[PDB]
Every structure is written in C-alpha cells, then in structure tokens.
Design a protein around this nucleic acid. Structure first.
Ligand SMILES: Nc1ccn([C@H]2CC[C@@H](COP(=O)(O)OP(=O)(O)OP(=O)(O)O)O2)c(=O)n1
Ligand SMILES: [Mg+2]
Ligand code: NA
Ligand code: NA
Ligand code: NA
Ligand code: NA
Ligand code: NA
Length: 326
DNA sequence: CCGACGGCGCATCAGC
DNA sequence: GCTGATGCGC
DNA sequence: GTCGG
C-alpha cells in the first residue's frame, strides 16, 4: 500500500502498547492514526504532512520523520530486542490469551509454543482451543470460501426454521476479498425487544451446525452470542480446509438495523461513528440510538427504519458497507 | 492544560 | 447462589 | 497518544 511502511510501524506500536504496556488508549490512538493514514491518497513526505490528519499528533509525526529518513524506528528496534516484550507479544497471538495472562505465563516460565503444548492443563477452555488452532487462526479466508460458508450457514439455518434470517456481516459484508473470520447476525420473529417467545433460539442453530459438522468447537456460548470454530467440508482425497473462527450474534428482530450496523463494522469505524454520535448528542449501541445530553443520562430509543436513519440522526451522509473499512 | 477516550456478551473469580 | 469486578472478546 | 473544552 501507499503508506504501508508507516501504517505497519504504527500497528506494531499499537500492539506493543496493548499487549506489553497494557495502555489501551495508546493502542487505540495508534490504530486510529494508522487508519486515517491508510486512507490518505498521497505517499506521505513528512510528519508535518501526516500531522494534518485527525488522529496524528506531534509524537507520531516525529516517528514518521524518523521512519521516512531511515526506514526504521529506533523505539521498535529496541522493543523487538526485548525478550519479555517478545514473549508476551507471542503469547497474545493465541486466542484467549490476553495481556494479563501472557505476562503471568511468562512469569511461570511458559513462553513458547512448545511450552504451551505440554501445559494444556494450565490453559482454560478457550485458550486450549486457541492453541489447537494456532496456525489455522492466523490464516485468512478467501471470499470464495466465505461464499461456501455462507451457503452452508444460510441453508442449515433454513432447515431449523424458515423464519430465521442469517446475515453474514463483518469484513464480508464490507466486500472484502479476504476475511479474518465469519461473523453471522441472526434474527427470529420470536425474539424481539419486547419479548422472547421461544427459548434456545441460538442454541438450536448452533446444534444444527454441529450436527452437519460445520461447527467443530466452542469458545464461549450464551443466549445471544456464540464464539467458536467451524470448517468447510472437503471432497474425497482433498486436503482439509483450515479451521476458522465464527461468531454468531442473535439480535432482537425489530433492532436489526442497529445490529447490522454494529456487526458490519469495522471496529474503528464503529468507534469513530459512536464518538461522533456522542458529540452530536446521541449514544449508539447494537440495539438502539438514543439521545444523550449534558446531564449525562441517556434517553429513550429513537425510531430506526434503515441503517441510513442512524446516520441521519448524527448528521453524517450515508456510507455503504464497502466504505466502512476503517 | 487536562479530562476523556464506543458499547457490550460470556468466562472466571472474590466477597457475602 | 447472587453480585460486581476483571479479562478477553466481538 | 490525540483531541477539544
Ligand atoms: N472492537 C470491536 C470488534 C468488533 N466489532 C464489530 C465490528 C466488526 C465486527 C466483527 O469483528 P471482526 O470479525 O473482528 O472484524 P472484521 O471487520 O470482520 O474483520 P475481520 O475480517 O478480521 O474479521 O464486530 C466492534 O464493534 N468492536
Ligand atoms: Mg470478522
Ligand atoms: Na492531526
Ligand atoms: Na490473544
Ligand atoms: Na500432543
Ligand atoms: Na504435547
Ligand atoms: Na469475528
């Protein structure tokens, strides 16, 4: 990409701040800067030029000037040489192992893949599955496979009850040619913001997907959110497809628009949009958009009849999903 | 200068 | 068991 | 780390 060296540097700094420093606002600041730089249509010549962008300040501009002049950043070169930072950064690549658990494992002498592989009994369920599919989870999913996965999910959901509607969201809905995982929004007329008329709505769908061997493992599961693993079936003599992460979120049917806005993302787009809503006097979650003034107490849910209605409330021109990849 | 940083689901734990 | 905090996740 | 109040 046009300013790939710069965005890569900022992303690595963001990851260091989240995983090692345990400084979430620096992690978010670096990612916000990387995002705005990624969409800038010019090859950046200086930190001063980048500083004109919202989210890029004095310190990142200084880093951009060093990176452009030398092709490196001394701060990262030192971080890369730090054993504790390297160990923590590695451990956090396992799903379920965050900054806290990574540092605790390092303290206990568990810091390599081999260490993890002989210490499964020291991992929780999620971490154990994250270790089992360490390599598969770092592989991307081509859109062709995402289409095959979409077919299986939509068809199996239909077999359970023709009234369910499953919508693939995330990067897929934004039109990405490759995705990190599969995000599925699910609705059923029996579950609305007013009542839940049938129990096990998410459970029956998870069960059916497990029955046809599509869903292979479970990381966490509740009444409205499933987080697990799935795998496309392979043909005779064919090498198996990698196991993939899949998230399914059952949202009240009458709140589909706020739900699909949320699940489509991106994550940075949502943070940016929700922050703009706050400045405009509103608060947005996956269920509703409500006013929120100076008193600091949220009001009643406003009528939403399209994703566009949410953008209108906050005085933003509508952006198609493909234009939300921040 | 300095307060705030999007919003919430599930797993795991400690206090009562 | 219930509740609220924390960790990790979307 | 960056921003607006
Ligand atoms: N911090 C987060 C993470 C996720 N999401 C929402 C928007 C994206 C959606 C699914 O999350 P991911 O699967 O992580 O995002 P993605 O855009 O689908 O990217 P990827 O292709 O890597 O799956 O959930 C969010 O609002 N806040
Ligand atoms: Mg995704
Ligand atoms: Na700026
Ligand atoms: Na992790
Ligand atoms: Na083994
Ligand atoms: Na082993
Ligand atoms: Na996901």
């Amino acid at each position: 990409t046009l300013n790939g060296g710069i965005t890569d540097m900022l992303t690595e700094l963001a990851n260091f701040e989240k995983n090692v420093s345990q400084a979430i606002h620096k992690y978010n600041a670096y990612r916000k800067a990387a995002s705005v730089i990624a969409k800038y249509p010019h090859k950046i010549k200086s930190g001063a030029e980048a500083k004109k962008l919202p989210g890029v300040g004095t310190k990142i501009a200084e880093k951009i000037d060093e990176f452009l002049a030398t092709g490196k950043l001394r701060k990262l070169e030192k971080i890369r040489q730090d054993d504790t930072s390297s160990s923590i950064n590695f451990l956090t690549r396992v799903s379920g192992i965050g900054p806290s658990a990574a540092r605790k494992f390092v303290d206990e002498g568990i810091k390599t893949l081999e260490d993890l592989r002989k210490n499964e009994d020291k991992l929780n369920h999620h971490q154990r599955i994250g270790l089992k599919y360490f390599g598969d989870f770092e592989k991307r999913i081509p859109r062709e496979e995402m289409l095959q996965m979409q077919d299986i999910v939509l068809n199996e959901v239909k077999k359970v009850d023709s009234e369910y509607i499953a919508t693939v969201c995330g990067s897929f809905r934004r039109g990405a040619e490759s995705s990190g995982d599969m995000d599925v929004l699910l609705t059923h007329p029996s579950f609305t913001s007013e009542s839940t008329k049938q129990p096990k709505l998410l459970h029956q769908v998870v069960e059916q997907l497990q029955k046809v061997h599509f869903i292979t493992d479970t990381l966490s599961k509740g009444e409205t959110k499933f987080m697990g693993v799935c795998q496309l079936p392979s043909k005779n003599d064919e090498k198996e497809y990698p196991h993939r992460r899949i998230d399914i979120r059952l949202i009240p049917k009458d709140q589909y628009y706020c739900g699909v806005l949320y699940f489509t993302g991106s994550d940075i787009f949502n943070k940016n949009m929700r922050a703009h809503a706050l400045e405009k006097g509103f608060t947005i979650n996956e269920y509703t958009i409500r006013p929120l003034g100076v008193t600091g107490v949220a009001g009643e849910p406003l009528p939403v009849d399209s994703e566009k209605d949410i953008f209108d409330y906050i005085q933003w021109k509508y952006r198609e999903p493909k234009d939300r990849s921040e």
